[PDB]
Design a protein around this ligand. Structure first.
Ligand code: NA
Length: 97
């Protein structure tokens, strides 16, 4: 399994497709879902008042050094994140760290 199955590069940056589990001990990448083409992300926040979405975005903004917005799935576990102004090569390097 490679992270490439969860990413695609658009004119605006990289869409990173994730599947979250809230209430986690630590916000971190725990795996890849090879059927859904998504990175499994544990989020150390409750899924109330948008707090899991906020923590998810904060985690990836820090990892990538780039603005991260949710473009689909604000109220779903399966969320698509636009990482603005970054290339797929840069995203792969950071996910592989
Ligand atoms: Na949330």
């Amino acid at each position: 399994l490679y992270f490439q199955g969860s990413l695609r590069e658009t004119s605006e940056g990289v869409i990173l497709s994730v599947i979250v589990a809230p209430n986690a001990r630590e916000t971190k990448i725990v795996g890849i879902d090879g059927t859904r083409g998504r990175v499994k992300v544990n989020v150390a926040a409750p899924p109330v008042k948008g707090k899991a979405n906020k923590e998810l975005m904060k985690f990836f903004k820090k990892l990538f050094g780039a603005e991260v917005v949710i473009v689909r799935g604000e109220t779903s576990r399966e969320k698509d994140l636009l990482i603005k102004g970054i290339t797929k090569k840069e995203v792969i390097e950071k996910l592989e760290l």
